[PDB]
Design a protein around this ligand. Structure first.
Ligand SMILES: [Mg+2]
Ligand SMILES: [Mg+2]
Ligand SMILES: [Mg+2]
Ligand SMILES: [Mg+2]
Ligand SMILES: [Mg+2]
Ligand SMILES: [Mg+2]
Ligand SMILES: [Mg+2]
Ligand SMILES: [Mg+2]
Ligand SMILES: [Mg+2]
Ligand SMILES: [Mg+2]
Ligand SMILES: [Mg+2]
Ligand SMILES: [Mg+2]
Ligand SMILES: [Mg+2]
Ligand SMILES: [Mg+2]
Ligand SMILES: [Mg+2]
Ligand SMILES: [Mg+2]
Ligand SMILES: [Mg+2]
Ligand SMILES: [Mg+2]
Ligand SMILES: [Mg+2]
Ligand SMILES: [Mg+2]
Ligand SMILES: [Zn+2]
Ligand SMILES: [Zn+2]
Lengths: 117, 217, 87, 81, 206, 97, 25, 129, 96
RNA sequence: AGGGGAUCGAAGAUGAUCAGAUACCGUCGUAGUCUUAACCAUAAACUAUGCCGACUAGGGAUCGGGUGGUGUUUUUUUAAUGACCCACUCGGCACCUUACGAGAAAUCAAAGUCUUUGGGUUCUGGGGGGAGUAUGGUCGCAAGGCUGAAACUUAAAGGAAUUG
């Protein structure tokens, strides 16, 4: 069956790591990119490579790849991860504690908003 | 050119640490074999043994050599290395490197009268490496190292001058015999004689002091 | 270690653990050295200057490295009401 | 653990130990003064009495014995000392 | 030693009770017992939050002192504190480790991940034990977020938590960052809280 | 060297237990040993409940079950693969499959 | 041979010898 | 049945030291124990120790200060002639420069250094280093 | 502990018990039982001379193969017949 | 020895199988298998691990006992009482994890507190064979048990683990 070897996949993470935004989703343009940015000893290997690299591209778009990150995705992750809400804790109705934990509050030097369970 | 990959080698290559005891003092784990190479030239290495052992292919046989190496100045610093190689003088080299990595501080002492610089040992100490167990006893001046040639040579390079020994177990398994004579003369600095009862402040550690001159870009 | 004429022989004098007074071996690579910051007039941690304990491998391996360490802080002031002798 | 006030154990833990295993061994048992709501006789007993104790007369019964703490018979009073 | 400033202030304990760090492990362990304040009926174990805070500040004290900011490796592999050890790492230098710890980290220098930190801060001693274990091969101290049933072996200063999720790991990590910023650096006049949100250390899916 | 700290099965604290007969090859093994299995089934079997439920009188009728505790020598339990040679560490696992 | 069949063999030997000896009071 | 009492004492101490503790419990409390504990404190191998009055034979809490390697008993309490102390110290002491072999002489219980001075001897109790 | 009595008054046991145990030591028992004087072909003496009865060509053990030249001698002092090896090339032709 | 003698079943007999098949499998079946009154004194009679004492570590079950719980559940009304639940605690059958420690390793909470060698104490071993033989004694109706050599012979026999 058609299971791509490591020499192929290795060089797929390689091109994606580096030249990500220069890459595409279409076989034919990448297939040409591989000739500029990289040296590959035979067209079929080059094609095999270029073909897996693009398969990856087509699925990196629909969510990140389990072991692959690059510049523009790292930026993408920083932003979207820095979401801050309207706070939560806050408090929306005092502090809801049971007892003993109250005894912990009292036996400490603290007033706080009351509640017993 | 030595290009240190660890924080420690950096602070060594810089002349920022001048003594090995500095490393011991802080129990800093040494990893680059050049650290000791610089911290301690004039460190002779001795070839103990090179007996071949054998295994199998997915069928038959396996030839490979087992080199045993002792490194030591002759002054409180000794190492022990054991390596196997596909080659001969390959393991030998590799062993030495592995030996220096093991270089340990020796607490020589006085048999009695503290006249004119230590000769024997602090105390009776003993080590054990699976079955073989060696035990060294402080000795009068003129006694000398009373041990089986191998163990003795390890003790010469160790910096010991006079000491009594007593073996136990299969002392014919040389590799095991030495590794315990090693464990033995390395356990000296572990023993709480009343001198060290004295209170100390504990130094700051060259890893925090020269911390700037330590880390990478 | 002295000698004939009192001169300080013996290559090096080893640290002693601060929870068991037990010598820190040159190969005791689970032996740890904590460095805690002294704080000047409110807030600002004084750089360069530490309150420092040393905890040996054996204490740490047996998991005593927190309780023991805690007693040590509370008794150099660094803690209030956490450790408690009588238990 | 590792360092502790052996000479001064807590109380709530000293009361959790076995009778013989405290700092100095001591009995967990007491004595009750027991009478019945009819008579006026101050008959003092032991927490783990092994005998069917009665009031001086009246053929009454103060407690029945067991595998431990005695069983004060039905309606009866008791102060502990 | 430490001024009345450094004392509790019910602002924090407000957060700590609300972030529910005070709720702890049903079955404890023998080393965490001083931290235990009391046991609720129906098997619960109330941590003494003041203890937590006292140790937490102590952690900061040590996170500081150590010179260079970045060789203070802060570790997680637990989801619930991966963003947290990132956000902390954002503020104080402190090179972060979220996800796979990769054995051969502190030992083994040939690796493409050879950290040589001067201090380690962990979130769960259990699920990160391989980091804990490895630290002890190479003299590195360990700050750690224990609960009541946590493998206290090969840690050092330990801050009690809930680490059963939510805000309990977020807050402690957040709070740590606050006092490492307070002490030295830039936050100052510790009386007033922080512009920086507390829900910044939390976990999402979404 | 010893292979199980269970030695053979589980006694520990007795010394002797009555022996049972192997259900299969009629051996004799101590009940404390003996690979034991229950064998509860339906008399009518799978395929046949159809004709059975059909051909009967009675409102649907409650199916009887047949019950049988089974006992096997190590020899016969192994061969009929009721139990299998597990790994050095696998052997430890007392867990039911 | 098996330890116990060895044991058997020698319990037989003894009887044989015991009876050959017997042959003189 | 208990046999030496000064055995189980020294052992507890020895045991408690090894496991990192800085306090022990010693039941029961013989005078021989205390005098030993005294000799063992005179050179600070232990710290403060406090008798506990059960209405019985006693307990003791000894405070440990590290630096103890082994406090041993020797049983049976052999007969040591004066020039045989030289021999025991040879055998069961770490170095010529320290350590102790405490005895029982008619001149009370004492470390071997002391007996060496007062010129006395008797049985052997054990050793400390 | 140890499995040997340690009493200050136990010498008898420790004494007889080893005396009892020296017997498993071969060299000791040979000496005590005077095997030397009894079963040994010499008296115990380091040498003996006897008269050569016949020449023998005993073949070697495995894995060797040769004809070791020996002689059946009859010892003068006690008439015992034992055989002895005759060392070195063709020395067997020196004895008759 | 008496009783008993269903079952299974040494010996034996048979049918198969095999080159042979005194076997394994199948069939018949003696003694035996049970009991009483006498013997016997041995088993891998095993945990292949003496007993009493002390000490060193973490966890969950479970058996017996006891204590504490304005806990649950049981009635005709919610008391006693029974079972059950939680914590504790002795004393058990064990299990789990650990590994400071021990070991040749397998592994071991003892097989640890042992060259930093001593709590008290009973027994046994001292290369492999010859050999549990010979001999003597003793007990036994007997089978046998207990006690138990040497001449000679021999360079290994043996353990644990590893890779084939
Ligand atoms: Mg041995
Ligand atoms: Mg087998
Ligand atoms: Mg069984
Ligand atoms: Mg049995
Ligand atoms: Mg047999
Ligand atoms: Mg027989
Ligand atoms: Mg027969
Ligand atoms: Mg002839
Ligand atoms: Mg037949
Ligand atoms: Mg016929
Ligand atoms: Mg036949
Ligand atoms: Mg027997
Ligand atoms: Mg015991
Ligand atoms: Mg336990
Ligand atoms: Mg009670
Ligand atoms: Mg039981
Ligand atoms: Mg292990
Ligand atoms: Mg040969
Ligand atoms: Mg084998
Ligand atoms: Mg194999
Ligand atoms: Zn009354
Ligand atoms: Zn079967």
């Amino acid at each position: 069956g058609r299971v791509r070897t490591k020499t192929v996949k290795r060089a797929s993470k390689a091109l994606i790591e580096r030249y990500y935004p220069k890459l595409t989703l279409d076989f034919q343009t990448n297939k040409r990119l591989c000739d500029e940015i990289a040296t590959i000893q035979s067209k079929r290997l080059r094609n095999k490579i270029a073909g897996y690299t693009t398969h990856l591209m087509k699925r990196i778009q629909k969510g990140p790849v389990r072991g692959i990150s690059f510049k523009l995705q790292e930026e993408e992750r920083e932003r979207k991860d820095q979401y801050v809400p309207e706070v939560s804790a806050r408090s929306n109705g005092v502090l809801n504690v049971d007892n003993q934990t109250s005894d912990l509050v009292k036996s400490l030097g603290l007033k706080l908003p009351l509640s017993v369970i | 050119g030595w290009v240190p990959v660890t924080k420690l080698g950096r602070l060594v290559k810089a002349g920022k640490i001048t003594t090995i005891e500095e490393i011991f003092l802080h129990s800093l784990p040494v990893k680059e074999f050049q650290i000791i190479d610089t911290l301690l030239p004039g460190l002779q290495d001795e070839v103990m043994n090179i007996k071949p052992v054998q295994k199998q292919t997915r069928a038959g046989q396996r030839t490979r050599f087992k080199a045993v190496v002792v490194v030591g100045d002759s002054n409180g610093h000794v190492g022990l290395g054991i390596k196997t190689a596909k080659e001969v003088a390959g393991a030998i080299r590799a062993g030495i490197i592995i030996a220096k990595l093991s270089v340990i501080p020796i607490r020589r002492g006085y048999w009695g009268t503290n006249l004119g610089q230590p000769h024997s040992l602090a105390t009776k100490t003993t080590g054990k490496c699976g079955s073989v167990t060696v035990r060294l006893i402080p000795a009068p001046r003129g006694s000398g190292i009373v041990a089986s040639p191998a163990v003795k040579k390890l003790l010469q390079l160790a910096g010991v001058e006079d000491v009594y020994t007593q073996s136990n177990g299969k002392t014919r398994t040389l590799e095991n015999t030495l590794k315990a004579a090693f464990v033995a003369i390395g356990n000296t600095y572990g023993f709480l004689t009343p001198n060290l009862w004295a209170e100390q402040p504990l130094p700051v550690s060259p890893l925090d002091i020269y911390s700037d001159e330590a880390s990478a870009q | 270690m002295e000698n004939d004429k009192g001169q300080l022989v013996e290559l090096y004098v080893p640290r002693k653990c601060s929870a068991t007074n037990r010598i820190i071996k040159a190969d005791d690579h689970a032996s740890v050295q904590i460095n805690v910051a002294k704080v000047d007039e409110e807030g600002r941690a004084i750089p360069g200057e530490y309150v420092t304990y040393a905890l040996s491998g054996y204490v740490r391996s047996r998991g005593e490295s927190d309780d023991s360490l805690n007693r040590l802080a509370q008794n150099d002031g660094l803690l209030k009401n956490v450790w408690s002798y009588s238990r | 653990v590792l360092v502790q006030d052996l000479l001064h154990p807590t109380a709530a833990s000293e009361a959790r130990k076995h009778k013989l295993k405290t700092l100095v061994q001591g009995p967990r048992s007491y004595f009750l003064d027991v009478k019945c709501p009819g008579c006026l006789n101050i008959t003092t007993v032991f927490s783990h009495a092994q005998t069917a104790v009665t009031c001086e007369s009246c053929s009454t019964i103060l407690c029945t014995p067991t595998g431990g703490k005695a069983k004060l018979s039905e309606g009866t009073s008791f102060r502990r000392k | 030693s430490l001024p009345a400033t450094f004392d509790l202030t019910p602002e924090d304990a407000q957060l700590l009770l609300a972030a529910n760090t005070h709720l702890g492990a049903r079955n404890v362990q023998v080393h965490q017992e001083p931290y235990v304040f009391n046991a609720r009926p129906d098997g619960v174990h109330v941590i003494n939050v003041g203890k937590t805070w006292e140790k937490l500040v102590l952690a900061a004290r040590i996170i500081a002192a150590i010179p260079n900011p970045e060789d203070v490796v802060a570790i997680s592999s637990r989801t619930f504190g991966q963003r947290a050890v990132l956000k902390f790492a954002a503020h104080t230098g402190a090179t972060p480790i979220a996800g796979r710890f990769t054995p051969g980290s502190f030992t083994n220098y040939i690796t493409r991940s050879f950290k040589e930190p001067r201090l380690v801060i962990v979130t769960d001693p259990r699920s990160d034990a391989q980091a804990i274990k490895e630290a002890s091969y190479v003299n590195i101290p360990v700050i750690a977020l224990t609960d009541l049933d946590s493998p206290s072996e090969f840690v050092d200063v330990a801050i009690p938590c809930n680490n059963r999720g939510k805000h309990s790991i977020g807050l402690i990590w957040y709070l740590l960052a606050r006092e490492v910023l307070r002490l030295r650096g830039a936050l100052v006049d510790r009386t007033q809280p922080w512009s920086i949100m507390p829900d910044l250390y939390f976990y999402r899916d979404p | 060297p010893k292979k199980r700290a269970s030695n053979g099965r589980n006694k520990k604290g007795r010394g002797h237990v009555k022996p049972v007969r192997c259900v299969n090859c009629s051996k004799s093994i101590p009940k404390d040993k003996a690979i034991k299995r229950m064998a509860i089934r339906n008399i009518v079997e799978a395929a046949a409940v159809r004709d059975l439920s059909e051909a009967s009188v009675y409102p649907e009728y409650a199916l009887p079950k047949t019950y049988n505790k089974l006992h096997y020598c190590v020899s016969c339990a192994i061969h009929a693969r009721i139990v299998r040679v597990r790994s050095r560490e696998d052997r430890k696992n007392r867990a039911p499959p | 041979m098996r330890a116990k069949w060895r044991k058997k063999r020698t319990r037989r030997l003894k009887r044989k010898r015991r009876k050959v000896r017997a042959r003189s009071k | 049945t208990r046999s030496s009492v000064l055995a189980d004492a020294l052992n507890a101490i020895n045991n408690a030291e090894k496991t990192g503790k800085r306090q022990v419990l010693i039941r029961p409390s013989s005078k021989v124990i205390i005098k030993f504990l005294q000799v063992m404190q005179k050179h600070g191998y232990i710290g403060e120790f406090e008798y506990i009055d059960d209405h019985r034979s006693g307990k003791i809490v000894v405070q440990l200060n590290g630096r103890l390697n082994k406090c041993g008993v020797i049983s049976p309490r052999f007969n040591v002639k004066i020039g045989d102390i030289e021999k025991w110290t040879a055998n069961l002491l770490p170095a010529r420069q320290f350590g102790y072999v405490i005895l029982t002489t008619s001149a009370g219980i004492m470390d071997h250094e002391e007996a060496r001075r007062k010129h006395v001897s008797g049985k052997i109790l054990g050793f400390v280093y | 502990g140890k499995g040997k009595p340690r009493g200050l008054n136990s010498a008898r046991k420790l004494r007889v018990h080893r005396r009892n145990n020296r017997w498993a030591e071969n060299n000791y028992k040979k000496r005590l039982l005077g095997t030397a004087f009894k079963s040994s072909p010499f008296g115990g003496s380091s040498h003996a001379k006897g008269i050569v009865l016949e020449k023998l060509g005993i073949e070697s053990k495995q894995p060797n193969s040769a004809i070791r030249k020996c002689v059946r001698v009859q010892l003068i002092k006690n008439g015992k017949k034992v055989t002895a090896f005759v060392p070195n090339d063709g020395c067997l032709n020196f004895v008759d």
